[PDB]
Every structure is written in C-alpha cells, then in structure tokens.
Point group: C5
Chain length 365, copies 5
C-alpha cells in the first residue's frame, strides 16, 4: 500500500500536481516500458516515411494516415474504461474488507472465556490462534505474498500457527478441497468444551462467540469467492481490445505528414507526438488502474500488506487475551466527575480556530 | 468458471495483452461465428459493387453508403451498453453470492447438537443433509448443469440426497409450487426434536440454528427470485436493437468506394475493413459480455461450477459434523506462550521486502 | 413476468437476436402505436413538401430542415435516459424484494409453536394467516391486480383471509390511515398469548417470532414507501421532454429534400426514414423501459405475479405449519454414513464434462 | 409529495406524455421565471441587433455570435449533471428512509409490556410517546414544515408530546447540543423500570426493546447527519457554473443573424429560439431536479409530508398499544382448515387473466 | 463543515445561483491561485505573439495553435472526472458514518448497568469514558485537527480522557502497532466485572453491551482502513494528468490569432479568454471537488468538525449515564389518554396548508 493520505490533507495550490512528482506506486512505473514501445514504433514509422519510402509509396502512406485518424474514436472507450474500472475498484475495496481480522473475536474472547489459571490462558490463546490459523490458511491460497512466506504447511507449523499434533489431525483429514475452514470447526469445539466446563459462564456468551466466528469465517469464505471468480475474461478482453485498437489508429493516424503536400490538418511537424503521448498516458494509464487492482494480493508496492496484517493480528490478539485479561486499573473518579459540563481543553493551534457556532439544526436561525 | 487470477498477480509489460492470447472462456469463442457472418456480408456487398452492378447503379450505391455512414452513431450505444452491462454484472455477482453454502450451518451444528453415540451422529448428519437437499432442489430448478445431473427426483434419491422414505413423504405433499423449501421445514422439526430430547443443551443454541437456517433458505429463495425475474425483456431488446442497427450502418456505411470517383473520405481501399472489424469486436463483444452473464448456471466454460460446489458442500459438511465432532488435539502451550511479542518469521523471499515502516496513522510523521 | 431465462442459458450464434422475434412482453407491443404516429407525421410532412407547397415555400421548408437537423443532439439524451432508467430499475428490483413473503415466518412457527391437539394447529395456522392477511392488505393498496381481486374488505372475508368476527374488530378500529399493520399487532398478541400458555416453550423462541415478524412488517412498510414516493415528477418530465424534443428535430430534420437542389448531405431519397425509425426504436424504446417498470404491480405481461404469490404463500404456509408439523421420517443412516468421502454420482451428460481440476486457490500452480 | 403512481400503472400510448400536462409538482412551476428571464434577455439582445446597433457594430456582433456558438459544449455538462443528480437522488431516498417511524417499536411494546390495569396502559403509552417525542424533536430541527408547527418547546408541551413536568426535567438538563436524544434515554429508563417491576416478563423481551429503540434512535441520528452534512458546496457551485455558463454561450451563440450576410448555418430566422428554449427546459430543468431534492423537508408540493407522518405515527402507536393490547378475536377454524389446498377465489376481472402456467424453474420445459 | 442546508430549503428563482455568491467553503477559494496562474500564462503567451515574435515566428506560432486546439478533447475527461469524483464522494460519505459515536453505547449503559451508589456511577462513567478514549485515539491518528489538539498521550491524560494510572498500563503494553483498540479491551473487562458483581442484572443485558461495543470498535477500525488505504495513487495521477494536459491544449489552442491572417474560426479577439476561463472553473473546479474530499479530517472550512463531535460525545454520554440514570418524571396520563383519536394541533402557518387528502394507497381512487 502506497499511502499518500498525509500529502493531501490540505487542498493547496499544488494540490494534486505534487503527486505527479511521486515515483513509488505511480503510473510512470507501470507505463514507461509500454510508453517507449509506443514511441519507438512511432519513430520507426516516421523515419520510414522520411527516408526509405519512395514518392509513390509516400502518397499511399498519406491516405492510410487520414484513414486511421478518422477511426481514432477516443469518446467510446472512455465509457468502457470507466464502467469496467469502477467494477474493478468495487471488487478491490470489497477484497480489502474481507481481510481476516480478529479484533471482534478477541473482544468477545477476553470478556467471556474465564480463568486466571494455566487452563484459562490456554483456552483463550488457542481460541485466538485457531482464528489466526484459518487466516493464514486463506491468505496463503489467495496471496502470493503470504504464500511465499508459507510455501508449505511445515512453514505454518514452524511459524507456530499450527502445532505438530494439530498437523497430524490436519493432514489425516480426508478432503480434496481447500481446508482453511478446518480451524473454524476446531474453534467451535473448543468453545463448546469451555461452555461445558464452565469457563464460559453463560449461554448468551456462548452464542456470541459462535456469532462472531461465523462473521470471521464468512470473511475468509469471501476471499475465496473473489480469488475463484475474477472479473469475467470476456469483459477484460473487450476492454483491452478497445484500448489497444485505439492506439493502432494513433500509431498511424497521428504521423507527421510532408508539409509540401498541403494536407488539411496535416501541415505541422513537432517530430514528437506530444499530445498523443499524453493521451497514451491517459488511456493506457486508465487501463493500468484496473490491471493493478485486479489482483491486489501480490508483492507490488500499492498491494495490500497482508503479511504485516497477519503479524499485527497475532500480536494484538495474544496481548488482548493473555496480558490484558482482567488487568484493569482501579475505578477512579474522573476529572469531570463533579462538573456540570465535561469540557476538555484545546491547544493554542486549535483554540483560535474552533470558536465557531454550534450546529443545532437548520431550522434555528 | 475460467480463473485467470494467477495470470495478473503482477502488473508487468504484457499486463492485459497476454489475456488476448487466451481461448477458453474468451471473446473469440463467443464472436467468431458472427464475425465471419459480418465479414461475409461485407465481402459480398463489396464484390457486387465491383462486378455485377452497372455504372448507373454504382452511383446510386455510392450515395447510399454516405447516407448510412452519417447514422453510424457509435457514441450513444456506448451508454446503453455500459449501463445495461453494469446491470447484468450486478445481478450476476449477486446470483453467485446466493449459492446455497452450508459452512455457516455446519459450524453451528457441530457446536450445538451433541452426542458421540449413534443417535448423536445421525442428528447432525441428517441436519446437514437436509440443508444440502434443499440446495440440490433449488439448483436443479435454476441450473441446467445441475438439472442434467438430477433430471428426476429418483436421481436425487439415488444420489443419497433423499431417502426412499423421505421421498414418500415428499411426493405425497399436496402442492403445485416448487417444493425446495420442504427440507427446511424438515430441518426445523429435527432441531425442535433435539432441543426437546436435550441433544441441544441450550435455548440460545436452538435459536442460533433457526437463525442460520433462515439465512440459508433466503439464499435459496434469492436464487428463485433471479431465475423468475430476469433482466426485463424490453431493455434486452432495446440494447440488442441499437447494437445491430449500428452494424447495419457499418455494413453499408464502411464500403470501399471507387477511388476514380473522388469522394471525400472515401478514396482509400484496404479490401478488408480492419477498423470496422475491430469496432465489431468492441460492440458485439461488449454485448456478448451480457449474453454470457445473463444465465450463469449453464454448462459453458465461464459459468459457475454448481455441481462441484454441491460435492464440496456435502463432503465438508459430513466431515465437519461426523469425523470432526469433539475431536480436538490436546491443549498445548503455543510457541509464543512465554514471549513478549509473538512474531512469526519470514522466508528469504519475504524478509528482504518487508522491512518497511509500520503504519501508525497519517498524523504521525 | 415474462420469463426468458431458459432462452439465454447458452450464448450461441442467435444469442440476443432471437429475443427480437418475441412478442409478449416486448418493445414492439409497447411502441407500435407511437411508431405509426411518428411515421404518419413524417409521411404527411413529406407529402406536403412534394405536392401542396409552392416553389417559394419549399425553399423556406428546406432551410427549416437543416436548422432542426443541427439540434438533433442524440448524445446528451443518452445520459439523462441511462441515469434515469438505472434509477427506475433500482427501485423496481427493490420493489420486488419487499414482496411480503412468509417463508421465514413459517419456519419459525413450525419450530416454536407446539402442540398436536386442536389448539396447537389453530395457534400455528392463525399466526400464518395473520401474516398473509397483512400481505393481502398491503398488496390491495399498491397493486391494481390484487385490488381488482379484493375490491372490498368483504372480498377479503369471502377469501377467508379475514373472519367475520375479525372484520368487526377491524372496522371498529378508529383510524383514518391505512390499517394493513393491524394483523401484525394481532400477530404479536397471539404470540404473547402462546408464550404465556406455554405453547412457545422458550423465551428465545418468543424473541425469534417477534424478530421475524418485524422483518415481514418492514417489507410491507417498504411497499407503502415506494407506492407513496415514486420517481420525482420533475425528473420524469425532464426526461420525457428531452426525448420528445429530440424527435421533433428528427420529424423535420430528417425530411428527404429535393435532389435537384444540390443540398449538402440532403441529396438521397429512401422515401422511408429507415435509420430514423430505428433510432426511434432506440430512444422511445429506452424510455419505455422506464414507463413499464415505474409501476410494476399492474396487469400487464411483464408485471410481477402478485396474485400467484399470494396463493403460493397461503398454500405453502398452511402446509408447512399444519401437515408438516412434527411429521418427520425416521432417522436412518445415510448412503455415505460408512464412507470416507461422500461422493454422489454424475449422469452421462455430466460425467464427461466435469473431470476438471479442483480449484485450491490461485497460489497453487 | 406529488403522487402520480396511479397515472402510470399501465404503459399505454400516452405513457409519459400525459405527465407533461401536470402542473402541481412539475418542472414548469420550477422553471417559468428563469424561462422568461432567459427569453427576455434573448429578445432584448436580438432587438438591439435589429434597430439600435450600426452596420459596423453588427459585423462585430456577428463574429461574437459565432465565437460563443463554438463553446456551447452541451455534451460535457450532461455528465456533471447526471453524476451530481444521481448523488442528490441517492441522499434524498436515504433521507426518506431515516424518517422516525414507530411501527417496529409498537409491535414490540404491545407484545412485551404487560398489564390491563391503569399502570399497564401508562407504561405502554408513555413508551410510545417517548419515541414520538424524539421524532418531533428531530423533525423540528431538520424540517421547516415541522418547525413552523412547533416553533417552541411550549408548542410541543401544548401538542401533548411533552408533559409540563417532563419539560422541567428537559430544560434543566445542562447541554449546549441538540437534545433530541433525551427521550430515548427516558425510554431506556422506563423499560428498565418495567423489567424490574415484572411488567416485562422476560429478559429476552427486554433486550428486544433496547434493540429496536437504538434502531429508532439511529434513524433520528441519521437525519441529523444529512441536515449537517449536505452535498458539498464546491460540487454544487461547480455544477451550477457549468449550466449557467452553457446558457451564456446560448444567449449569444444562438442569436438570429441577418440573412443578407450569407453566414454558414446562420441564414434562417425563427424570431423565437424554439430548440434553445427546449434545451433550456432540459438543462435548467435537469439541474432543478437537484435543487428540489437537496432539501426535501420544506413546504413545497413534492416535499415529504413530515407533519402527516407525525400524526399517523402518534395515532397508530396509541391505538396499537392501548385499544389493541390483548384484544384478540376468538381462535376459530379457518375456511381452509379441512382443505387439501387452501385456494382463495378470483374475481371475474382476474379469473380470465390468471390461468397462466405456474413457474417451477427455468429447467423444467 | 460548511452548512448551506437552510439556504436551499425552497426552490425559488435564485435557486442555486445564490450559492455562487458564497465565499467560505467555495470553489473560488480553492481555485483563484491556479486561475491567475492560468491567465498569467495566457497573457504572457499572447503578449509574446504581439510584440516579441517576428513575422516568421508568428506564422509558426499560428500552426501550433491550430494543432493544440484539435487535441482539446473536453468530452473524454468528463468521464474520468465523474467516475473518479463519484468514487471519492462515496469514500467520503462513508468516512463520515464511521465517526466514533457513543449514542448507541450510552443508551445500553444507562439501561443495564445499575446502582445509585458511588460504585454504580463509576461503572457507568468509566464505561462511557473508555469508548470515548478509543475515539480520541483513533481520531488523533487520522485527523490532523484532532492531532493538533492531542499531540501527545500526556495531552490525552491532561484532557482527562486517560488517567495517569491507565497511562502506566497503556504505555507498558508491548506492541508496535497503533493501540486505539486498547480501551475496547478495557471496556470488555469492565463489563465482565459488573456482570460478575451483579451490577448488570442479566445475561442478555451483558450480550447487548458486547454487541454494541464491537459496532463501535468496527467504526474505529473502519477509520483506520480509510486512512491507510486511500484512493489508489495511479488513478489519482491518471485523472490529474488528463485535466492538466487538457489545459495545456487550451493554453496554446485558445490563443487569439492575428485577424489580418484570415484563419478559420480564429478571426475574433476578446483579449481575455472568457469561455476558456469558465471551462477552467469547470474542469479544475470539478477536480478540486475530489482534492477537498480526499482527506476530510483536516482544518479547512468544509472538513468534518471532529473536535466538536468529541466534546458533544463526552458531554452527552456523561449526562445520559450520570444525571439521567433513573431520573424519570412520574407516570402521568397523557393529554389523549381518554381520546378516540390522538390529534395534535397545527399552527396558523401550517393549518391552511395541510388540509390535503390522506394517502391510502394508489389503488383507492
Ligand atoms: Cl439474541
């Protein structure tokens, strides 16, 4: 993920123009190889028209250039690109929200599974580790970044996500399908055991764990839906054909013709097609937005940081259910306990800006 | 389903252009018959203008060609196609999410229905089989792929989805409407029995089963909504009329006229309409995106694998509620039980890439 | 509802072109009266220019035709139509999903209200009849198809939806507003009675009934929201003005002028405006998509089958809570009870097509 | 609200053209003042060119007219208007759904708060009155229609929404923010009291009241979100600048030039710009769709009937929880109690239309 | 936030034109520096063509101007801007709804945590303060307005959001990730303590607190998702390149050429490009809509008032759970207790407008 949120906090004079100076996660990185190949074909096709062609063939070349320039219909592609890109951005934001996060699970686990003894801590840690084990097992199937970190199940055991004994019970399961769902069934059996043993003091507390685990498992099942069912291949090929056929019309249709011929609209030579190379940055770059977001789980710079999230989830969920289990500060009276209004102060950079009138509704003038 | 997710994990130089080399699930498979019929009508209409017509009729043919070329309004159709296609892709992704999956049901069933004896395993397996029976019964009504596998109810009994005794109770039900809902009522009676017999130890556990069964049944009821109510026929006919009337204007409006006539914009012969056949790949291919997704339950290559899902659901749901019922590994201390931070390692292909600074928020520079 | 789902299960050579041969629920049925009035005004305006006008008035008529042809701006309307139509299709699919269905209610009622005696069957049937009574009472207010079947409340009593005694309690309620909500309050009093009498054995079972009844009532309340608040009238008048003002520009701007005048672009006579009548099928037909879906509850062929749904709901909900109450087949061992994998067979038309490799994720090459 | 739902139930020959005859809630009411000002500036600018200008100044005026006619780019604005209008219609439909309705609350209150005595009726009525008090207090802040009915809190006490004693407790609350949330806290204290006193017989019944009250309060909190955060002002000013700068190009760019000058495209005089005034109805009317829906809570004809809803909610919620508390008709056997199929009849206008085949799925030919 | 909701309550003659007179939160504030730089480059490029260039170089300059005017393709950018802006407005409205609000939490806390003694008030106030502590801790990471008010954790302790003892337990937590989640774990331990001590009298009351806390925490977790994952940088650079390359074509392509040259479309001088500067207000202003909403948490005038919300939330949540705990007015009979219809009156400005017929449905003529 390339975060530039702090760069556009204000809307100043260099608002969005300053981000064109950025290289990491940018369009120039994604386009410069196709950009030199587009210009290299243009300069070769121009240099042929200046030296190697004859006077008969040049007049034939001139009529071909005016033919292709008519079929450079840039208007239509700007709809197929926009609808398709919006479809790709919609699946990409929804792939991010289906990332297996255990924050909802850990707040239930610390509040409902009980016990300061060695069995109380083991119930809670194993419950959070089973959630995180499924999260590794769904991310190693959809993320090549996660998969290069856990290429085998032995790596998952080495990482401590699975124990050697659990792997014996894992690999002796007879199923030909992906078994990321297996620690979720292990989760429901550990929660059913602790309810029977009274570590879960309540039946409603037990229902909450199974409610929030299925939310977790449906997020893992949603990442399998996106990985299996991509944007349909025909709609990807239809969008790519229209963009690349528009730049075949520009490769011929924008060639600089001989001024001594007196052609309409064709009498000026820039020797470099500046506005065609800028239109190339537009349309090939607009399509490269979809090529970058269609598989957001790789190793490139703007991709999701799945491995960092896995570390953040295992660290926080152990910390919350072991070190933070029933470790509260003593109940003290707050600083506005005996106050009419509870009003926290402002700093000197925020006092002189926030004397504004409080909104009460639009009918109170 | 044609999965090409692994082909676009990186955004390299051959980003989307490599998918134009793909044949299975592609646009060339969907279009090549209409493409040769479009070119065959163009070559016949051109060859008439070169040999069989007279000099009087050719001048009449020339004015007809410039007439039709004015009415080739490609701009407008690129809106009717985009809005209609987005409408078809929206119904198609939502048809996929309404697929009857039993993963939420099996995690509740293994955690709440109890008993290692022969009656405990029968309660749980019959509960998951009733869910899967409705799933076969809704998919044989909407999927010709599923229906060719289960053409009769005898096939469903042969497949073991229904028992002979249940079919007696099934076929003696007096109803003229589709009875896919029937094992869901059978489900609520089996769950009410096991709550009365104490296999379901809790009232909140009983409510969770009925909560998650109605989620399952509403997904089956959603697949009946899409099968009954398609994209409206008038809006399908309006989109198809505009695309096919645009290519009647191209069939005449793009004919290669006699250069010795000196017509404006009509003096060059390619003998094959290259940019009109590429525009045909655009607009007939953009419409063929909607024709492929309007009924995603058939046997074609990019359709949903409904039969594979039925096998995956019956196998996993038996495995989870029979072999995995109360079969836990022993509670062991984890590898980070006595660690301050729980930090799993990286492989050598992921260590040198993930030394990046951790995000703390955009206000912490 | 005109269902053509089975016609487009494959994407073959006659993909969408075969639906242009369809008459019921089609665009030709919705347009042919306006189409002959458009052509009849064109043929009258042409025949005036050929016989009744003089040579002075024809030259004045010619300049008016080139004036209107400039203002035939077909591009802009293709946005106002697409956004407005998408807005109408969005409300129309959401009007369908708010149809009062009792499937969620009947699965709770058979699982929670108990008793094989005469009082047990009466509790359950009256609970499902009160849900269906509200459903008739909301559909007779929004559907002229349902209203022509139940023009009075006497018809609802005759249909058995309301008893004569309930109508006494119904019509003596002092309220000036629509009372479709009244059997929902009758529902919550019947469920509160059976919980007090112990027919509902559980407090969590009681909460589930009131949870799923408010879902039902909110769907009935959603159909009152759409019936009261249509697409806003100004946005309907703005879209209709733009389409009809475009075809006033075509009625004059596409007239066939005298070839002996030598006008640019105006020298060819087809005597029938083929591409203008096809553009009329486009734009008047695209607007007729919205006119057909703006009130989907009538009697026309593509409208929702509300009356059929009412019969389907009353039949299934009586069958589920009376004949299917606690009528289970005996718990038998299934055909894969002693199997490692539970694998149902394929037919001969599905065996040779589904030997495909199972998807495990996109990172497992 | 101007309801025209009954006018478009069929799609007949005068489908949408009949709504152009409508005046109340229409575009002609919203535009006719700006329309005469547009035409009055056009007729003044034309009459200057015919009489007061000289022959030198007219030739200067002619070149200015052809300059502005080039910059009348109607295409681009039709995107800024469509996206912005769709954004305004999306917020407007969601402002309607956040209207404080008590139907979900009253069905829970009649089913869970108990008691036929004077204290039982007071618990239930005060619970529904506290919900309705917040609904008045949120609507008087966002609706000038509601605010002109309740300009002070004394008016709310006079209306009986608040008692004099509650207003003492209301106005002695020390808070500078809008206190519409205050009867919702009063609600949770009344429900907690009746659970302690046993009027609420169940803990699950108590949780349902607090569940459905927060749904009610979040709808009131959503109406404060829309009232505070409108469509952003810069995006409103960008859309308005583009529409009004297009009609400055039409005010000059469509002037009728002297025919004796022989200008291209400028030789015909209609003395009234018919197609420019129709384009004005298009673009100023399309923008007036957003100006009418951006604040839907006023007193104009197509605005929401908030005051009528407040009366409908207070009347129905008293009727349901006082007159309809435990007032059921006796449990009778229904008319299809001893029937195999329960089939209600059709009237003569619905019998001959609904002999259609029942849908069983698209795979059953 | 610049609220102009009260200015557009009616749709009068100065409907949206009056908002072009507004300065605070407007487009003129966001654009006037780029607008003078665009005009300053235009006036310098014009003044070079009038004085410093020679007659040879001016003829070369003239052909460059007609070259760039062809590539001023304003149509295509109006799609890339609309789709991208709609994407930015969609994330911006969803960033607002994820603001940490404690209204749902405080209604549960006052209804479920019990006790008038000093320990009862401390349980409730500390529960609402822990929710508000996370809300400060998530807003200081994403809002530079909130962060300038709380630059350190000492400021949070000084503000009374954290106690000195809690900060000891806060800063000794071993985690490298942002710890805004920490008082949510503190919340679940305080609620689990009060359930064990019987201040929470019910198990269902305990489940409701943990249900509504995870809703609160997921809103805080959603604000971290938007802050980390912005609009992708390539799609921001593609939109900015297209807008700025269009105005490089206008900077040259709209220059006023010498009239004595007789160029087509280039013979008129306004000495100020009025319609190009208005198109600049359109396209640079349409892009400045996205630059203002892409980071809505700053200090600019139309940004969200996060600091005001923090004060509003801490004040209301203390008031509701301390001063308003079990402080009800006595149960009185209401003003319509003995009335058939409960009908509140109208004022004189609302009586003469609301005699309209009550809607009963669209089928009741
Ligand atoms: Cl619950």
């Amino acid at each position: 993920t390339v975060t530039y949120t702090a760069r556009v906090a204000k809307a100043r004079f260099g608002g969005f123009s300053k981000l064109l100076l950025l290289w990491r996660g940018s369009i120039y990185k994604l386009l410069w190889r196709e950009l030199l190949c587009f210009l290299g074909l243009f300069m070769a096709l121009s240099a042929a028209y200046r030296f190697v062609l004859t006077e008969e063939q040049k007049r034939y070349f001139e009529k071909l250039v005016l033919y292709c320039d008519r079929y450079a219909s840039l208007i239509p592609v700007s709809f197929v690109l926009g609808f398709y890109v919006t479809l790709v951005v919609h699946r990409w934001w929804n792939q991010y929200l289906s990332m297996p996060l255990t924050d909802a699970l850990m707040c239930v686990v610390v509040g409902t599974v009980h016990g300061h003894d060695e069995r109380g801590r083991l119930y809670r840690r194993t419950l959070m580790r089973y959630a995180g084990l499924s999260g590794v097992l769904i991310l190693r199937s959809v993320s090549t970044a996660v998969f290069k970190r856990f290429p085998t199940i032995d790596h998952v055991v080495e990482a401590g996500f699975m124990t050697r004994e659990e792997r014996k019970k894992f690999e002796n399961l007879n199923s030909s399908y992906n078994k990321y769902w297996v620690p979720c069934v292990w989760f429901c059996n550990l929660a059913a055991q602790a309810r029977r043993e009274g570590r879960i003091r309540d039946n409603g507390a037990f229902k909450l764990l199974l409610e929030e685990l299925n939310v977790f498992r449906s997020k893992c099942g949603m990442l399998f839906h996106y990985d299996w069912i991509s944007v349909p291949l025909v709609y990807t090929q239809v969008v790519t054909i229209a963009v690349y056929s528009y730049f075949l019309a520009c490769l011929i249709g924008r060639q600089f013709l001989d001024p001594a011929q007196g052609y309409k609209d064709h009498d000026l030579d820039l020797c470099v097609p500046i506005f065609t190379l800028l239109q190339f940055f537009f349309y090939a770059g607009w399509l490269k937005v979809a090529e970058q977001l269609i598989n957001p789980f790789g190793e490139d710079d703007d991709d999701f940081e799945t491995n960092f999230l896995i570390d953040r989830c295992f660290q926080v969920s152990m910390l919350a259910v072991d070190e933070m289990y029933d470790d509260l500060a003593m109940l003290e009276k707050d600083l506005y306990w005996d106050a009419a209004e509870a009003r926290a102060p402002y700093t000197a950079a925020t006092a002189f800006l926030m004397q504004q009138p409080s909104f009460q509704g639009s009918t109170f003038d």
